[PDB]
Write a protein that binds this ligand. Structure first.
Ligand SMILES: Nc1ncnc2c1ncn2[C@@H]1O[C@H](COP(=O)(O)OP(=O)(O)NP(=O)(O)O)[C@@H](O)[C@H]1O
Ligand SMILES: [Ca+2]
Ligand SMILES: [Ca+2]
Ligand SMILES: [Ca+2]
Ligand SMILES: [Ca+2]
Length: 446
């Protein structure tokens, strides 16, 4: 587990749900800010080794529209789930403010809900309470990523203390992946019309409508919305779960494809060349360097540092799922050349873009998942000198400093030999901060 207090100080309360309270916390070394869910062990535990397993699975979710968790720590009283701090508030507030959204704006929002939800399901995670309250805006910035929160805990923990979004089958006690598609459908109905499809004076009347699956597009505002959007909603608000479309099919719907047709332009050329140069250099590093850089980028960077690359990531991510596949990387490189006025055929005079991406894929796809996930993209395409600030190297050092004050050669090896002899420049067995810094610099070096 971990020592929370050594690492973070508590800055303020952010929110309180039924599972625990969410606090703003600050890394004592980096000054970087984080959201922490504090879960009381004794009031809440329902299962601590089974909990650690499932939190591990939550931890490795790597997708732009899913809450990012960095670590789980533990005190004698509590678990501390440390994650990314989002400052845009709930999608719910954006609906109240805007009332309802153009087809273009609704499609862009719901596409991200679809992408995140598709990703969760492929990892055998059902949300169970998908609602605009449980989707946060990354920031107050204009076109920011939305982030799905508040899921994964239900088996491990007991809660303590809305009708609009629940699928009919949840009323019968069932909560399969289709219930999330229903909830997302209710959301889309709301984004486009501003009104819930199953609506009533109170909960009693609402549930009566949910139960029969009866809704319509009778409100006057529906006149001005395409049949494409209606077709999508209808597929999502299908009563029988087995006839209801999957999240993947939602994400692939022609209405979606039409309004999130994001694609590289000339204005993207500077950031695209940056990413490519960093990627080329990344691939040239040895495996040990690549792993430490990936570890460092994904644990220690900020949302503000990844924002240009996230835009590029989106423009390369043709099918809108949260990841880059091989063909997406090939097209991207081709498009990059075209925009620049360069003929891809010039590359022989000594291999094609295809050969190059194929040999790169094993290098960048570090978990062998078949796709380049967000954090693998960021680690490879960022300017890795950004990792070499003193505070970050100090936090990295400290992460591996399990015993006392220095990193044992016997720790570091089981925490990963050829390189170990080199970094230890005085040869006293253990690795101090100075050798650790030099090793990290060597990693960024080439
Ligand atoms: N990553 C985050 N960034 C900023 N605020 C957050 C973050 N996660 C949660 N919050 C806030 O903290 C509150 C509680 O979070 P939540 O994950 O819903 O708690 P919970 O007890 O696990 N589930 P619930 O009882 O349904 O609220 C939310 O209402 C948010 O306002
Ligand atoms: Ca993709
Ligand atoms: Ca991968
Ligand atoms: Ca050690
Ligand atoms: Ca030494």
């Amino acid at each position: 587990q971990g020592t929370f207090a050594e690492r973070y100080n508590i800055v303020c309360m952010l929110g309180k749900g039924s599972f625990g309270e969410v606090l703003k916390c600050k890394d004592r070394i980096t000054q970087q800010e984080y959201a922490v869910k504090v879960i009381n062990k004794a009031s809440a535990k329902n299962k601590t080794s089974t909990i650690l397993r499932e939190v591990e699975l939550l931890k490795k979710l790597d997708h732009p529209n899913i809450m990012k968790l960095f670590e789980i720590l533990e005190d004698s009283s509590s678990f501390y789930i440390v994650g990314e701090l989002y400052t845009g508030g709930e999608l719910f507030d954006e609906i109240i403010k805007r009332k309802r959204f153009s087809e273009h704006d609704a499609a862009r929002i719901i596409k991200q809900v679809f992408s995140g939800i598709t990703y969760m399901h492929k990892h055998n995670i059902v949300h169970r309470d998908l609602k605009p309250e449980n989707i946060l805006l990354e920031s107050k910035e204009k076109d920011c990523d939305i982030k799905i929160i508040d899921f994964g805990l239900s088996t491990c923990f007991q809660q303590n203390t809305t009708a609009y979004y629940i699928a009919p089958e949840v009323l019968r006690g069932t909560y399969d992946e289709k219930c999330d598609v229903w909830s997302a459908g209710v959301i889309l109905y709301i984004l486009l019309s501003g009104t819930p499809p199953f609506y009533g004076k109170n909960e009693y009347d609402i549930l009566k409508r949910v139960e029969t699956g009866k809704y319509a597009f009778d409100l006057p505002q529906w006149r001005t919305i395409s049949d494409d959007a209606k077709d999508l909603i209808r597929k999502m608000l299908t009563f029988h779960p087995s006839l209801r479309i999957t999240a993947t099919q939602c994400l692939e719907h022609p209405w979606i494809q039409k309004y999130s047709s994001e694609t590289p332009t000339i204005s993207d050329l500077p950031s695209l060349e940056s990413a490519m140069t960093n990627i080329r250099q990344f691939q040239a590093e040895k495996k040990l360097a690549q792993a430490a850089l990936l570890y460092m980028a994904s644990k220690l960077t900020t949302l503000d540092e990844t924002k240009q690359l996230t835009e590029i990531f989106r423009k390369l991510d043709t099918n809108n799922d949260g990841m880059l596949d091989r063909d997406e990387l090939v097209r991207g490189y081709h498009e990059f050349m075209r925009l620049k006025g360069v003929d891809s055929n010039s590359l022989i005079q000594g291999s094609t873009i295809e050969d190059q991406i194929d040999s790169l894929m094993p290098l960048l796809d570090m978990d062998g998942s078949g796709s380049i996930e967000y954090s693998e993209f960021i680690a490879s395409a960022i300017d890795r000198t950004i990792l070499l600030s003193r505070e970050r190297m100090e936090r990295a050092f400290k992460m591996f400093d399990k015993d006392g004050s220095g990193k044992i050669s016997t720790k570091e090896l089981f925490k990963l030999e050829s390189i170990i002899e080199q970094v230890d420049n005085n040869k006293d067995g253990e690795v101090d901060f100075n050798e650790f810094v030099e090793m990290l610099q060597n990693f960024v070096r080439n």
